[PDB]
């Protein structure tokens, strides 16, 4: 019965399919796109990234 606006759900879905394949919200999908090294090292798995 809860409620959440639609803008937020749409933004999450569109972020998560914006590259043409399904992107997982994990170090496998988030940390493998082209975000540049420093943000990647911040999220997870620092040593390998740098």
């Amino acid at each position: 019965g809860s409620y959440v606006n639609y803008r937020h759900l749409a933004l999450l879905c569109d972020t998560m399919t914006c590259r043409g394949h399904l992107m997982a919200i994990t170090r496998h999908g988030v940390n493998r796109q082209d975000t540049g090294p420093l943000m990647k090292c911040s999220f997870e798995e620092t040593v390998d990234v740098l």
Binding site: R7, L11, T15, C18, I25
Partner: protein, 49 residues
């Protein structure tokens, strides 16, 4: 049962919150009125359609 539930849900939900935040954080509405990420690619031509 109720006590253990309250005491064992929290870790996983916290992980999900962290993971989503790091996923989406840098998307923002621009002066073009578009929505874009840090890399400057389009995510939504207008916020929320």
């Amino acid at each position: 049962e109720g006590l253990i539930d309250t005491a064992v849900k929290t870790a996983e939900t916290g992980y999900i919150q962290r993971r989503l935040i790091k996923s989406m954080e840098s998307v923002m509405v621009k002066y073009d009125a578009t929505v874009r990420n840090s890399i400057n690619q389009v995510v939504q031509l207008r916020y929320g359609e």
